Design a protein around this ligand. Structure first.
Ligand code: UTP
Ligand code: UTP
Length: 158
C-alpha cells in the first residue's frame, strides 16, 4: 500500500477460527516462521475489502466461506527491525484485524494459487499458541489482537 506520513503501511490481518478453540496458523513461504494472513490495503480499498482480497488471494476463500465475528477498532502498529527497513520510507505497518469463523470445510482453503504464495500451507493450532510463536517484533500486536478476540472464540468452543 501507500505509506502514511508517519512511515506506516496500512495493512489488515486475519484470525480464522473454528468451533474447537483453534485458529488457522500458516507457514511463511519457504521459511520456518509462521503467522496469520496479512496484506496491504490498496488505494481505493476499505479495510474490509482488503481483508476479503487477502482471504481470496492467499487463503483461497470467499466471503461465503466465513463469517466476521469481530474486528479491532483502531490501528495496531509494529515497527520493522532497523536492519529490515529499506530506503517515502516505510518503518512498519499499521494493522486492522478481523476475526473470522470458518464455516465451509477445511478443504476449501487453498494457499498455493499465487505465483509466489504468502504461505506454504497451514494447520490448526491452540488459541494462544500464536502469541509466543510469531516473530518477536509482532508479539505486542498479536497479544492485543488475541486478547481482544479471546472471549468470542472461547464461546464457540464451549
Ligand atoms: O507442525 C509444526 C510444528 C512446529 N514447527 C516448527 O517447530 C518449532 C518448534 O515447535 P513448537 O514450539 O510448537 O514445539 P516445542 O516442543 O519445540 O516447544 P514447547 O512449546 O513445547 O516448549 C515451531 O516454532 C515451528 O517453527 C513447524 O514448522 N511445524
Ligand atoms: O517471521 C518473520 C516475519 C517477517 N520477517 C522479515 O520481516 C520482513 C517484514 O515482514 P512483514 O510481515 O511485516 O511484511 P512482508 O515483507 O512479509 O509482506 P507484506 O505483508 O508487507 O505484504 C519480511 O520481509 C522478512 O524479511 C522475518 O524474518 N520473519
Amino acid at each position: 500500500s501507500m505509506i502514511d506520513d508517519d512511515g506506516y503501511r496500512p495493512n489488515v490481518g486475519i484470525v480464522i477460527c473454528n468451533r474447537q478453540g483453534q485458529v488457522m496458523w500458516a507457514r511463511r513461504f519457504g521459511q520456518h516462521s509462521w503467522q496469520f494472513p496479512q496484506g496491504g490495503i490498496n488505494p481505493g480499498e476499505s479495510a474490509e475489502q482488503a481483508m476479503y482480497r487477502e482471504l481470496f488471494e492467499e487463503v483461497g476463500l470467499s466471503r461465503k466461506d466465513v463469517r466476521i465475528l469481530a474486528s479491532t477498532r483502531n490501528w495496531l502498529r509494529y515497527k520493522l527491525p532497523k536492519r529490515l527497513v529499506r530506503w517515502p520510507v516505510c518503518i512498519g505497518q499499521k494493522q486492522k484485524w478481523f476475526l473470522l469463523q470458518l464455516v465451509s470445510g477445511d478443504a476449501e482453503i487453498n494457499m498455493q494459487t499465487s505465483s509466489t504464495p504468502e504461505f506454504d500451507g497451514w494447520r490448526w493450532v491452540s488459541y494462544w499458541y500464536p502469541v509466543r510463536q510469531v516473530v518477536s517484533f509482532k508479539r505486542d500486536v498479536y497479544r492485543r489482537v488475541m486478547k481482544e478476540f479471546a472471549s468470542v472464540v472461547m464461546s464457540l468452543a464451549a
